[PDB]
Every structure is written in C-alpha cells, then in structure tokens.
Design a protein around this nucleic acid. Structure first.
Ligand SMILES: [Mn+2]
Ligand SMILES: [Mn+2]
Ligand SMILES: [Mn+2]
Length: 184
DNA sequence: GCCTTGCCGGGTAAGTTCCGGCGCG
DNA sequence: CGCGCCGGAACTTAC
DNA sequence: CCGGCAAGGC
C-alpha cells in the first residue's frame, strides 16, 4: 500500500526529527514501547499530525490510543505500542531502500521538524550526519543541490543546506507536495 | 549589485527517561 | 508472574 | 532553529 507507505515515511520524518522511538524498562519486568512526536503548535499536533497517525494506527490495527500530553514547553503526541514501535524502527533500519514516494515524504517530515521554516534559506539541522548524507543523495537524485557541513561547533550539529539555485524544485517537489494526503 | 552560503551566538522548542498506575493471559 | 498500555512531567539540549 | 554578519561568485 503506497498511501500508507508514504504517510509512514512522513510520520517517520517527524519522529526522527522532533520525537523518538523509545523502548523503556520499568520495575517488575514491566516494559513500554513509545512512538513520540513532540511539537509546540497545538493545532499542528491535533489537527494535522494526529489524524495522520490515527489513520496509520487504524490501518495497522494497532489499538493503542493517541495520547497528547501537554507539557512545559511543548505538546507530546505519544503512542504506547510495541507493534507501532517496531513498525517504525524496522522501517528506520531500511531507510536506504526507500522508494521515491517514501524519500519525498521523509524529507518533507524531516523538514517540518528540523527545517528552516522561513524558507528565506533552505536548511535542515541534525547531529546525525549519516542521516543527512542519505537525504543529500536522495536530494541529488531529485536534482536538488546541497551541501553538508558542521553548523554548530558547540553541540556538534550539522546543517544540510539546500542550494537556493534549486529553490523551486525543492519547495514545489518536496515541501508543498500534494502526494499521499490525508485521504478523505 | 546582487544573490548565495559559511559562520556563530541566543535561547526555545524540542527530545529523554523517570514515576505511579492498570491490563491481561 | 511476566510483560505491555496509561498519564504524567522532571530534566536536559539540539536545534 | 533563528538571524545577522561577511566572504565570495557571477
Ligand atoms: Mn531532532
Ligand atoms: Mn527539532
Ligand atoms: Mn521542530
């Protein structure tokens, strides 16, 4: 299924960027498995992201709930689910095999999470150079030129800079792509 | 003249893991 | 008994 | 992430 594969890739962009995948161990041989996306904007969390996760949850027949925990500085969308955790973690492991549908959705998600949102410049930040290098190759194959270098010497954070020469192709083909959209 | 992009400090919007519960065969 | 979902938030830093 | 600064390219 390609609409599920794409929405997955997109969610996985948000997760890797602004959340995580947590395998927790508690006292008494108790455990927990968490798919997390955090975000400041209540409306983006509840009106765009959650309906997407909800759709994926239903289609996978995961029957965990979508928790939304309001925190200090940010909303946390959380799904407590061994099945969903491994679904994304295994999907992460085979990121290199992503097809063009998945690549674009992943880059879009990653950008919504980690990207320069003013679009004055086109920039993705991350400590994970290998992840950025994969994104770079995909972008090069989509005819979007880009460079990677160490932006934040204090915290070890790399930036992937998308060349403004390929501005239109990047925004039009990646950011504002109508592909795999909340069907309805 | 103009656009592009490496650089680098500010600080908030993220990320991570702990808690106490309850569920269920 | 042996794990897996809830609901929260303290805590730290990578964007 | 944001955003101002300055080096460099055409
Ligand atoms: Mn991140
Ligand atoms: Mn982030
Ligand atoms: Mn973000």
């Amino acid at each position: 299924n390609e609409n599920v594969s794409g929405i997955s890739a997109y969610l996985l962009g948000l997760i890797i960027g602004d959340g995580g995948l947590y395998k927790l161990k508690y006292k008494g041989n108790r455990s927990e498995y968490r798919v997390v996306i955090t975000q400041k904007s209540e409306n983006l969390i509840k009106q765009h992201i959650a309906p997407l996760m909800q759709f994926l949850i239903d289609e996978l027949n995961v029957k965990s709930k979508i928790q939304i925990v309001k925190g200090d500085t940010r909303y946390e969308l959380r799904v407590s689910s061994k099945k969903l955790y491994y679904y994304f973690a295994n999907m992460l492991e085979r990121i290199r095999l992503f097809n063009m549908r998945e690549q674009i959705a992943f880059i879009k998600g990653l950008y919504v999470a980690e990207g320069d949102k003013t679009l004055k410049r086109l920039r993705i930040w991350n400590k994970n150079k290998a992840l950025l290098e994969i994104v770079s190759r995909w972008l090069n194959n989509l005819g979007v030129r880009n460079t990677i270098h160490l932006d934040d010497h204090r915290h070890g954070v790399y930036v992937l800079n998308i060349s403004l020469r390929d501005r239109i192709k990047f925004v039009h083909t990646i950011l504002s792509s109508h592909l795999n959209p909340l069907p309805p």
